[PDB]
Write a protein that binds this ligand. Sequence first.
Ligand SMILES: [Cl-]
Ligand SMILES: [Cl-]
Lengths: 300, 300
Amino acid sequence: GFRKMAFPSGKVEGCMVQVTCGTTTLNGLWLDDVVYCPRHVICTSEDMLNPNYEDLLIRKSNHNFLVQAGNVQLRVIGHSMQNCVLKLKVDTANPKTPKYKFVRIQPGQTFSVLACYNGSPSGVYQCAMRPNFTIKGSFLNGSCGSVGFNIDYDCVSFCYMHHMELPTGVHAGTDLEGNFYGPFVDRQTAQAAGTDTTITVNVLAWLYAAVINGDRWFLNRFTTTLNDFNLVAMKYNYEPLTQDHVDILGPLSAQTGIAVLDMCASLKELLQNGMNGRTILGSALLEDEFTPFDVVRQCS
Amino acid sequence: GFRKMAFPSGKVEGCMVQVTCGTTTLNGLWLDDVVYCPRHVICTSEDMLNPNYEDLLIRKSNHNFLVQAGNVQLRVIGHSMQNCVLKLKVDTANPKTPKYKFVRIQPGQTFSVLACYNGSPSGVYQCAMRPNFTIKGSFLNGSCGSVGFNIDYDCVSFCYMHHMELPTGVHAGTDLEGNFYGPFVDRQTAQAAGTDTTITVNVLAWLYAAVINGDRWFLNRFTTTLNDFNLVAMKYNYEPLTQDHVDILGPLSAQTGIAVLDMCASLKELLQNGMNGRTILGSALLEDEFTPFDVVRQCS
Ligand SMILES: [Cl-]
Ligand SMILES: [Cl-]
């Protein structure tokens, strides 16, 4: 009774366009009279290993950028590079521009991804910005410039633009000012994300979700302390739990009558002893891609 | 690198309205000049245990059905009950009606759910119509009349309308002609779904997806026969695999160079021996809610 849920994507579908430079085609985000897209649209297959973006860009004029919205060709009247994204000024404002903002999201927070190909929406799914600043997406060639977002009432907060795949099949991108999340660079090399630490607060949130939905086998008669919990968390590459994490979990704790440190005691045994074949909300692993706010919103 | 993915929901968002009868409010689907909704919108909290729908309906006139689309009130000019859904004729065609069809989906197939409350889209997620004709959704009070759908190019095939929750937290509903999937009835009793059998063909599909994405530890040097595989499948309440299942898996088999019966040999050992702590595409359980077509579409 508890699902990984993405926001409705209608307001973002109307912002997706196709951007082509030469033989390279990817997606752009069309808001007011600007199309945002990854700068590596100007790269050929040769250039992607060590691109000199400033030098490659100087070779490109407005008319080299083919921007298409359905059957309609948009007229490019200006271009500039801001960090790792290109801003293509077009001579038409997008009539479907929603209320929007750009935000740089924190590690541990979630957002929906509208995977796109050739400017056309393909599918929607929920991601978390991991502590090592990667995401576990589903992206193929041609998906760059797909965006991640949250919706707040009727306002769309864009937080992610897709640029690349990392060694382990995880994904890296930028905010809409073109700065990467994490230490990554838009070049076709193997780059390391460090240790993939687990978002402890999100695991606790999800264990509360499990209690709300009738899954309680993992509750025990014990409690712990923050410092003693974190001694175990560390060994398992879990993020240290802080008092502010504890306060953020207040509402779920209160709704369930399970003190946060009692739930930590249960988590401690799950980490040391495992699940011995049992499941929690239909998973045999501890899920860390629901925030406290995500649990509250879905369970109300 | 492989995610549970829902279709983009924009075309369905524009079809959702609020329907209220008395103190009961749920969602309706507004296509052309008709609003489809669950008939139990005419029930009070008392009536929901053993409703006599024909008798309750005879007490209701057009003006008792409050249909609202955003700030705009729709004028109800006719109503009729078709099986478990009500059809409310309104005096305005929905300008946002997409190309659409109604389809009764087969067990084992998947679709996206646009969960809605008060006629407002809340979130989107992918479901499968299970063999016991339930789904594993995420639905609260007020979510009835939320729909499930597939998109084929620009045509929306509506296949599910939400009506109720079953003992184990799973969900039951109807097609858009108002016939339940499965043996369920729209009355507030505890009703059984039988044994929840696993969609074998979908598990195989997903194991192929795992190979495509570099997860191959579970491959072995063995093969099996259809009849010998099914002797093991049965004990685990897996669906019997048929030759037509084998042919549907052809393209994935061919793309990976793993004969379907070789993959069955691998599945056989996973069922008998378990996963011994290992994971497959980030799950410690065998996933059966991807069809062969879903894997092909996402991996291309
Ligand atoms: Cl006890
Ligand atoms: Cl070997």
